[PDB]
């Protein structure tokens, strides 16, 4: 890990150009230094949706659970590509705190967001996911119920 590069890209997250901020978020995710986590969390609130996607992706890559609460908020971002990137990142981080928000995201309007939330729940796995799926199977409806019934038949 190059602390010089980390500092340089952290600084670039404040660049006037959104394309530069995208590169910075992406670079920091690839480096994996947790020193980038607080700046990337700020970047989750960027005006530009590609910066928010890249910040979410990078925070998923670093895997620090400090990102969990801000990514949960990003699950209801106006932009579907951001919602998807948040769900995928929450799956990668693997913290069970994300299970109930991801379950709600199974009712997202965008089918690829729904698919990504379903896969993230599968990646988290365990008994909280299992319990949520039985509840869905019994009291849910629509795509979420489909996901649940399939989950329980496969686990």
């Amino acid at each position: 890990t190059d602390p010089e590069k980390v500092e340089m890209y952290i600084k670039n997250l404040q660049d006037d150009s959104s394309v530069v901020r995208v590169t910075a978020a992406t670079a920091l995710g690839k480096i994996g230094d947790e020193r980038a986590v607080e700046p990337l969390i700020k970047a989750l609130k960027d005006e530009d949706w590609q910066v928010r996607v890249s910040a979410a992706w990078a925070l998923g890559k670093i895997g620090d659970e400090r990102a969990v609460e801000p990514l949960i908020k990003a699950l209801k971002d106006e932009d579907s590509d951001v919602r998807m990137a948040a769900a995928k990142a929450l799956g990668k981080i693997g913290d069970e705190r994300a299970v109930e928000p991801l379950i709600k995201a199974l009712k997202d309007e965008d089918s690829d967001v729904r698919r990504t939330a379903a896969y993230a729940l599968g990646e988290i796995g365990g008994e909280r996911v299992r319990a949520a799926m039985e509840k869905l199977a019994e009291t849910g409806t629509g795509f979420a119920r489909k996901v649940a019934v399939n989950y329980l038949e496969t686990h």
């Binding site: 394309v19 995208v22 590169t23 978020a25 992406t26 995710g29 690839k30 590609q50 996607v53 890249s54 979410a56 992706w57 990078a58 590509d81 998807m84 990137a85 995928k88 690829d112 698919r115 990504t116």
Partner: protein, 200 residues
């Protein structure tokens, strides 16, 4: 000239593979001439036409409500009109798009397969992504790293190639302007970009 737009049901995630059929006589023909691309990253994908229905008249209501398009000859002004998020530092979006499609799928599928080691699926995916670089100002990092397209190294190289052809830039392309219909969303479907070089 009105067309149905549809996805072929084979893709499980973005980008979906799109075709058009003349509304006058719709067939589920998967020929190169009917291959089209999503021209608007943020808008809805055309509904699927399931392969289980080989004839249009076999599609059960309401799934025969496919989105309807008007085919127009593309040129720079109308490309920019229907893709307002186009890459702003590109003066002639038309020649850039023409460059991408000339070097992309399906027109250039043989070189893409031979020299970039792709199958037709990869070539098509990478062509769609390169179109979006210009139609929607998508960054290289979003396309290659952060947007979830899971590109392998050969796809990333082919994408760079296509993007360079577009940036480094007779024939034009068709544009399919979304008009109406589509059971899934009933509004706000993508406009579609033709993939066939049209002489004019």
């Amino acid at each position: 000239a009105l067309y149905y737009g549809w996805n072929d049901g084979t893709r499980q995630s973005s980008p979906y593979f799109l075709y058009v059929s003349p509304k006058n006589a719709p067939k589920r023909e998967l020929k190169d001439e009917y291959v089209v691309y999503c021209f608007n990253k943020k808008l809805y994908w055309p509904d699927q036409w399931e392969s289980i229905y080989s004839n249009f008249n076999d599609i059960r209501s309401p799934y025969n409500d496919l989105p309807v398009y008007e085919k127009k000859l593309g040129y720079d002004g109308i490309f920019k009109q229907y893709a307002p998020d186009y890459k702003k530092d590109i003066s002639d979006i038309a020649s850039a798009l023409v460059a991408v499609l000339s070097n992309g799928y399906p027109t250039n599928k043989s070189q893409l397969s031979t020299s970039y080691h792709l199958n037709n699926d990869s070539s098509r995916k990478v062509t769609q992504l390169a179109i979006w670089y210009f139609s929607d100002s998508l960054t290289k990092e979003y396309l290659k790293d952060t947007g979830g397209y899971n590109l392998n190294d050969m796809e990333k190289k082919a994408l760079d190639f296509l993007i360079s052809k577009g940036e480094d830039s007779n024939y034009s392309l068709d544009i399919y302007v979304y008009q109406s219909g589509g059971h899934d969303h009933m509004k706000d479907y993508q406009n579609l970009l033709g993939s066939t070089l049209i002489p004019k």
